[PDB]
C-alpha cells in the first residue's frame, strides 16, 4: 500500500541525499 503521509516525491523539507 502507498499512504500519502508526506512521501518522498511530495516533500517540502526533503533532506539532502547522497552525491548521485
From TrEMBL:
RNA-dependent RNA polymerase that performs primer-template recognition and RNA synthesis during viral replication. Initiates RNA transcription/replication at a flavin adenine dinucleotide (FAD), resulting in a 5'- FAD cap on viral RNAs. In this way, recognition of viral 5' RNA by host pattern recognition receptors can be bypassed, thereby evading activation of antiviral pathways. It is found in: Host cell membrane; Host cytoplasm, Host perinuclear region; Host endoplasmic reticulum membrane; Host lipid droplet. The chain holds residues 2282 to 2301 of 3012 of the full protein. Belongs to the hepacivirus polyprotein family. It comes from the Viruses. Homodimer. Interacts with host SPCS1; this interaction is essential for viral particle assembly. Interacts with envelope glycoprotein E1. Interacts with envelope glycoprotein E2. Interacts with viroporin p7. Interacts with serine protease/helicase NS3. Part of the replication complex composed of NS2, NS3, NS4A, NS4B, NS5A and the RNA-directed RNA polymerase embedded in an ER-derived membranous web. Part of the viral assembly initiation complex composed of NS2, E1, E2, NS3, NS4A, NS5A and the mature core protein. Homohexamer. Homoheptamer. Interacts with protease NS2. This is Genome polyprotein.
Amino acid at each position: 500500500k502507498f499512504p500519502r503521509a508526506m512521501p518522498i516525491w511530495a516533500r517540502p523539507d526533503y533532506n539532502p541525499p547522497l552525491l548521485e
